[PDB]
Enzyme design. Structure first.
Site, PDB file in Angstrom:
ATOM      1  N   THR A  73      -5.957  -1.088  10.572  1.00  0.00           N
ATOM      2  CA  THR A  73      -5.592   0.034  11.445  1.00  0.00           C
ATOM      3  C   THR A  73      -5.379  -0.392  12.898  1.00  0.00           C
ATOM      4  OG1 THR A  73      -6.610   1.717  10.023  1.00  0.00           O
ATOM      5  CG2 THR A  73      -6.134   2.348  12.333  1.00  0.00           C
ATOM      6  N   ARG A 102       0.827  -1.224   0.000  1.00  0.00           N
ATOM      7  CA  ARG A 102       0.000   0.000   0.000  1.00  0.00           C
ATOM      8  C   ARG A 102       0.855   1.264   0.000  1.00  0.00           C
ATOM      9  NH1 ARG A 102      -1.669   3.013   4.925  1.00  0.00           N
ATOM     10  NH2 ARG A 102      -3.385   4.441   4.346  1.00  0.00           N
ATOM     11  N   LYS A 122     -12.936   2.988   1.222  1.00  0.00           N
ATOM     12  CA  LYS A 122     -12.660   2.965   2.646  1.00  0.00           C
ATOM     13  C   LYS A 122     -13.837   3.556   3.436  1.00  0.00           C
ATOM     14  CE  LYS A 122      -8.561   4.514   3.640  1.00  0.00           C
ATOM     15  NZ  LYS A 122      -7.371   5.435   3.619  1.00  0.00           N
ATOM     16  N   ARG A 145      -6.148  19.025   8.240  1.00  0.00           N
ATOM     17  CA  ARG A 145      -4.984  19.022   9.130  1.00  0.00           C
ATOM     18  C   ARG A 145      -4.751  20.398   9.761  1.00  0.00           C
ATOM     19  NH1 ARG A 145      -0.437  16.092   5.559  1.00  0.00           N
ATOM     20  NH2 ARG A 145      -1.565  14.187   4.954  1.00  0.00           N
TER      21      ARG A 145
HETATM   22  O1  LIG Z   1      -5.088   5.105   8.616  1.00  0.00           O
HETATM   23  C1  LIG Z   1      -4.600   4.018   8.219  1.00  0.00           C
HETATM   24  O2  LIG Z   1      -3.677   3.391   8.786  1.00  0.00           O
HETATM   25  C2  LIG Z   1      -5.133   3.451   6.881  1.00  0.00           C
HETATM   26  C3  LIG Z   1      -6.662   3.277   6.946  1.00  0.00           C
HETATM   27  C4  LIG Z   1      -7.325   4.634   7.314  1.00  0.00           C
HETATM   28  O3  LIG Z   1      -7.358   5.584   6.526  1.00  0.00           O
HETATM   29  C5  LIG Z   1      -7.966   4.729   8.695  1.00  0.00           C
HETATM   30  O4  LIG Z   1      -8.018   3.710   9.422  1.00  0.00           O
HETATM   31  O5  LIG Z   1      -8.492   5.819   9.073  1.00  0.00           O
HETATM   32  K   LIG Z   2      -4.485   8.108   2.828  1.00  0.00           K
HETATM   33 MG   LIG Z   3      -8.449   7.203   7.388  1.00  0.00          MG
END
Ligand SMILES: O=C(O)CCC(=O)C(=O)O
Ligand SMILES: [K+]
Ligand SMILES: [Mg+2]
Ligand SMILES: O=C(O)CCC(=O)C(=O)O
Ligand SMILES: O=C(O)CCC(=O)C(=O)O
Ligand SMILES: O=C(O)CCC(=O)C(=O)O
Ligand SMILES: [K+]
Ligand SMILES: [K+]
Ligand SMILES: [K+]
Ligand SMILES: [Mg+2]
Ligand SMILES: [Mg+2]
Ligand SMILES: [Mg+2]
Lengths: 498, 498, 498, 498
Positions: A296, A49, A238, A90
């Site tokens: 995550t 990734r 996602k 951010r």
């Molecule tokens: O944040 C990560 O580690 C990748 C998946 C994501 O965008 C999240 O879990 O918010």
């Molecule tokens: K990202």
């Molecule tokens: Mg995220």
């Protein structure tokens, strides 16, 4: 029953020899070199990734090239995923690069870029220009994985909110902002995202991890941004906000697969509800047979420690028991001290949960929910899995060109490997997000059309033997078309390895 | 099916109002003051755990006194658990008090006590006389919570093994030793454990969490050490090695309950196998209707952080879904910075998991494994739970003096509270480890003998109203004896709240 | 599964000692004397049916008196059923008392009563004055249990149809006519029926078998005809035409129970469809817990022969396996040569099918279809049956005054007898159509109010002992109210016989 | 559940178009002419039964010739079954050729052949030398199809029992004897059976209905008597006494099929136990995939009457629901007045029962009892049926030369026809006893070897169209081998009709 299955479980029996679930690793400084990538791959990486929240196009190009070089040395086909920035918010930078807040500190947050570089304890910048339309006095701003929350006291003006710090926290450059329960109306594909996506197409990435997908319509925007040459690239949406969960059905129907992106999700909705969202989302993907990734903090402590916590091990095991095709690592591999070891743990934990799985339960549960009459290829693929169970087949073998038929077999959750002989390298790479599948490339241009399937079946059976899936005399369940039918498999055979 | 249940989950509907699962908190410098304990109790602690691996009797006396003072202030009945140090294998001392090993170093380990105080890189002592019988060439010895691994190369004499060091490590004096997969013949109780148990009996502790239980015989030795005066104190056996897992049936039979002590267990067996042991042990406890506690690193990161990781949330949720009565906190409350917030999160996660549970599946799975014919009280108790489901009862009410009947109802996993009216304060405190149960004390010395049950039933029904379990006109399922049967409940009634 | 249950069946095991299903016998010349009735009762009759298609009020009064005298001598409570003529259609008499027809004989049928006594091969009377409105040229008239059919050639006039005989048949006085697929609009309660029904009320019959019920509305007409004094008499609707089958749901909801009246039914609809109607109707009655009777030709050949056919034995067994509370005899006992023996066969066959029944299947199937939340008495009664299974109870004991609670227990199909202690003799008699129930009369006027239930429970437990249902030390499941609740049972106890 | 399935039945919807069950008719003076047989065939006879208990070889030769002539005229393949007389126990003769007994008469029975021809009221012969060993004092002897019962009072000498006559009866010369519940040691084949079998082999009969089979060893003796030349003739063992029921497993294993010969069985065991034996035997045959025939008095009354009784309709329907492949007619077609009408009714009842069957329940029950791992052909065949259900296939097509594969598909009880293309006329005739199957002959001598299956598949698919099983664009499930596997089918295809 699960209860009865549980009481029969043993820690003293051999585990499955062939790992069914797949591991997605995020590349970063720990892991970008050709040599580090080789070790990741040996360790159990199937998909690399790239996180386009950070790094330039040149940085990711290095990742792409190094992945392809590493995989070629090993003779592997490794998928490449581009994970979009998307509508991230951010803070700016701070004076000295950190500032510290105490409960009750009053602080102004400003959209005025003049303050971007010089943030302080009393005033700093957030990079979302519509901030003061989005959050009203009384609302809360979540900062740094939701670790610090600010109550908005007032709107000083169109560029500035005065805020009350609710808890103690230290703040460094460019931390994440979340605004759950606010009207945030940023595009799913920004200008930055569009160039990223175009870059992905130019460089032949296999799949997009599309951040913050809220609607089917946003999935279609990502597809449109990928354009004519990007039509066969998977879009894995996602799910990481309330609205993405609400719209899960139409989002699944529009996507090629789903990531349960638990990091943002657990800030956007109450953290304790992530466990229920996860179960729900994964099972909805299993029912329609689309790949699903759990992501995550799965082995988070192994970013620093040579061993994971008890919670982290159970988290990986239970994502597998929940039904997930893949499990994912972020900082653990991008920047951690033990990238190879964390992949190796994850692999061992997968195999354990896989061996603990009650072998035919998923098959029946998924079958029982499918509308009747099926199309013929689904009746073939499901009944081929049932045959595999019936003869205790050590492998199945399917011909697939797009990957569709391999995914259709995997939908029914066999307990043995699915050897997929495919005529496309991209199909080899994309099927890395699909449980059980192991891909073998048949180069039709070089070896001929193979209309009677016999070259590809031989390739598949030799691979089964060579890689120690099965031996002479073992029965294998082989799925493809007869000599006439085009476009789908209409045939299943049971065959003894010669 | 689980799959179908998952896909129909409603993530954002209201959760259950009454938490069924129970939370054990370890007390320490973060949590020992009367004020801290009250807050812990308000946050959702039901049992206070004293870890006798550390701290003096006087230290734990303060915990005992403060728990009782805090509970009395709030009108609560809080269980008090004594968790024994237990027997141990340790190395001897080292010259200069430390030595460093590198992978490939060859070191002898000896059970000759002559070497106890002069360990070197070349040779050092381990205080387990049976060592050279327990582990053969090719077997492993673990040192320092499994952080260093030795492979046994050969037996040099009847007291000495030549070993190969597997990894870099610095040893200091008297580190812990584990012999993975190895039979271990230590006594159930050490000399210190005896003084500790004697203290627990004199101070009226409600339960012992007995460390390192390997056999039923050891449980009986713990029971024997508690003596006549400790005969009513629960023994919760801590399963910490492969022997305990192997002998789980007979250990369960001998014990009042089980703790899945994952920290030590995941040192003795491969970490990934802890998930299998956990599922098996919890389900085996569910099947015989005995309380089971899941322990260790469940919300570890909240020791330092105000929110838990994603893995930690799923760990707690899954321990509940597995069927555990209790979940446990160690360092998170003993010494962490956010003791109240960790218990509060733990409570909220338990409630989500409880609300996602498919309500009658556990009931049916458990009932289906019981031997027929049952004893009458168990038919009464299981059928009472059946009735509760049939009328959507908001509460059950049971009269139990020993706690037996209350546990027997909880065995069948109703989805409402079980109000237990008891004549014993210790029963109120002990039923804290049992899912769903909420205890009310009936003072028979003060209010009379209540042969015909009416005063106790009134008290229980008043409690249901006062504590907002149910209202006027709600059906409650009420379990006790008729006017003449003694020793167990032979009667179930459905009663509308007046 | 049924398959697995079947392969485990044995012809070599003891049968159930207590017959659960009930036998309805039609009284006639073979069986009307007090002595013949005694033998019927000894043989297994629970309900005596009077067929008011034939015989005068004086004839049936003799039946009523002789039944009561026989039952009093034996100390039994035997139900009395009045089975209405209803909208029957018949031929008149013939010259010489028979005539014979050949396929192709032309014959006039006339509504003109002038021809009633003097029917011939060329012209005879049918007692339905609207015949020529009801059946048109091309229609068919069915004669004598549908054995002979006439095609209507033409309508000679308002009183006369010219008909073509379709098959050979001999015809005697007053045979039945059926007109399936015709608009037949006769009342459910004719003037004759009304006087019959009034007579039934005057003489205290327990139940009506209401012939040819087509609609809920017709059930209400029968109830209205029974009037103020007939309110507690059961109406068992007989289903014997197309429209009765169509309207089965609303007919069941309006009635106290159902008879599948297979004789007329198998002429009104194609005979082969009766097997499906039967299965459907019986199961619909089981689900709502209302008594259902299977009737007609069950042991037909035993009218003349000392033994039944293989088909007849299987028919009785399968009506029991289908779920029927009762099975019925008509000519077999009314006019047959072996009345006692045919009842005795029927009883033995019942007990065999009862012992072949997979004991908890009905319980679960019926439970699973009930709407949740139940009323409390249904949760009590069902959960009491579940308890009985759990402890292998040899009897249950219920107090019921109307019979409702005994029927509610029987709905859940326990495998042991249901002893019903009742304060009404009529309840004793009416519960004869309910599977498993054995009634004991408690005369409250004579023995007192029994508010604490203790006299009736003692009576029931002494009866259980005396009649060899259970002995000292056996557990019995006892259902009634606690000391407060009125109108329904809210309590279940398990009790050891003293 | 069965209950839920019953309540949803739609009595008046269209029934299945293709009858799955099969009808065996006994041929006799009513049905022997070529014209009668054609009509029988059109009415739905699939197998002609010759009862060799009566009639000479020359008589049966006419049946054989006429069956073949009638079948050829209609283009049908009709099975021919030879049903042996079998061994028997009979009394001797009587003086004056008859004696009458009254209940309470005391009579000696002797195995001393001296008395063979001079039986009296006082003493008579029974030709079973082991009599005095087989039945002890208190045991029963049945005489004349069970119409007279003797209780054995005592053994008088090693050849003579003193008996008590139970009921009035007139005996004539050489009546049949049954020893209920008694081991009986007669040879498998009598001297007459040998001449009969030799005749059946020389004339090419397709199957033997072997009478009075008690043990597997007897089946093997029948098989041995058929010899090399009869090796392909099916043996259908007739289960007629308790020994046969007891030894059913090993008898099934040795046989090609079973007849539940209820007439003789219900003489040897209590009539009510025949229903238990029937359910058990049919299900045991279903489980191993061997044809089972239910026989005897199924539509008895149609011997004389143009419509069946209600019991008879339910008997036929229930034999189908039980799982029987075939049902059988004896006197109804051999000598009855309505041979065509009885077969037609029988056909219509089979079809109703088939249409009410819960379609996939049998499939699942049968699959769930099979040992895993299966042989490959059985995985192929069961999964092919699974596929058929999944796509609502209107037909299946299988290539089978021995009939094996066809029976193996029928084992899994699909709900559509199984078209079997076979290279053997005898296979067409033999598959008549197997549910669902419809055979088409492929003449390999005439059309060639068809290695690649194409001609046989085309023939089968043309048949599906011509015979209105399916149309252009319908999916058919097609089972045979791939190009190289010999001896069994390893392949399933789903094919749209061109
Ligand atoms: O944040 C990560 O580690 C990748 C998946 C994501 O965008 C999240 O879990 O918010
Ligand atoms: K990202
Ligand atoms: Mg995220
Ligand atoms: O470690 C803990 O938190 C206490 C439970 C225990 O002894 C273990 O997990 O090994
Ligand atoms: O006719 C009988 O025997 C009583 C039931 C009835 O009316 C019928 O079956 O048609
Ligand atoms: O009796 C028949 O119809 C032939 C079958 C047989 O032998 C029997 O049922 O006993
Ligand atoms: K401890
Ligand atoms: K009538
Ligand atoms: K015969
Ligand atoms: Mg420990
Ligand atoms: Mg009728
Ligand atoms: Mg016979």
């Amino acid at each position: 029953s699960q209860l009865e299955h549980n009481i029969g479980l043993s820690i003293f029996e051999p585990v499955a020899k062939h790992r069914a679930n797949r591991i997605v690793c995020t590349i970063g400084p720990s892991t970008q070199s050709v040599e580090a990538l080789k070790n990741l791959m040996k360790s159990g990486m199937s998909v690399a990734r790239m996180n386009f929240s950070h790094g330039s196009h040149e940085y990711h190009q290095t990742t792409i090239n190094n992945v392809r070089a590493a995989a070629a040395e090993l003779g592997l086909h490794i998928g490449i995923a581009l994970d979009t920035k998307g509508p991230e918010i951010r803070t700016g930078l701070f004076k000295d690069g950190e500032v510290s807040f105490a409960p009750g500190d009053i602080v102004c947050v400003t959209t005025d870029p003049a303050y971007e570089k010089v943030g302080t304890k009393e005033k700093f910048y957030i990079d979302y220009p519509q901030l003061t339309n989005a959050v009203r006095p009384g609302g809360s701003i979540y900062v740094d994985d939701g670790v610090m929350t600010l109550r908005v006291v007032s709107k000083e003006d169109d560029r500035t909110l005065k805020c009350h710090v609710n808890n103690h926290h230290r703040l460094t450059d460019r931390r994440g902002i979340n605004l759950p329960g606010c009207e945030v109306d940023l595009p799913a594909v920004s200008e930055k995202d569009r160039k990223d996506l175009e870059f992905g197409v130019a460089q032949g990435v296999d799949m997009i991890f599309a951040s913050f997908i809220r609607t089917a319509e946003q999935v279609r925007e990502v597809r449109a941004a990928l354009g004519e040459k990007g039509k066969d690239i998977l879009i894995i949406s996602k799910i990481e906000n309330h609205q993405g969960v609400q719209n899960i059905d139409s989002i699944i129907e529009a996507s090629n697969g789903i990531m349960v992106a638990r990091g943002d999700l657990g800030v956007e909705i109450p953290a304790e509800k992530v466990c229920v969202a996860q179960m729900c989302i994964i099972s909805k993907c299993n029912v329609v047979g689309k790949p699903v990734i759990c992501a995550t903090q799965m082995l988070e402590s192994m970013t620093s420690n040579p061993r994971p916590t008890r919670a982290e091990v159970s988290d990986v095991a239970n994502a597998v028991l929940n039904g997930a095709d893949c499990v994912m690592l972020s900082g653990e591999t991008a920047k951690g001290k033990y990238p190879n070891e964390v992949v190796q743990y994850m692999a061992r934990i997968c195999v354990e949960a896989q061996s603990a799985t009650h072998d035919t339960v998923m098959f029946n549960s998924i079958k029982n929910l499918q509308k009747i009459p099926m199309c013929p290829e689904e009746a073939v693929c499901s009944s081929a899995v049932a045959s595999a169970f019936e003869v205790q087949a050590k492998a199945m073998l399917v011909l697939s060109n797009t990957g569709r038929s391999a995914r259709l077999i995997s939908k029914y959750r066999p307990n043995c490997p699915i050897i997929c002989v495919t005529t496309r390298l991209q199909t080899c790479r994309q099927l890395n997000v699909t449980r059980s599948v192991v891909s073998v490339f048949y180069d039709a241009a070089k070896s001929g059309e193979d209309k009677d399937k016999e070259k590809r079946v031989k390739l598949g059976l030799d691979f089964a033997k060579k890689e120690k899936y099965a031996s002479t005399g073992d029965v294998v369940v082989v799925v493809h078309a007869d000599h006439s039918v085009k476009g789908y498999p209409n045939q299943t055979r049971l065959i003894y390895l010669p």
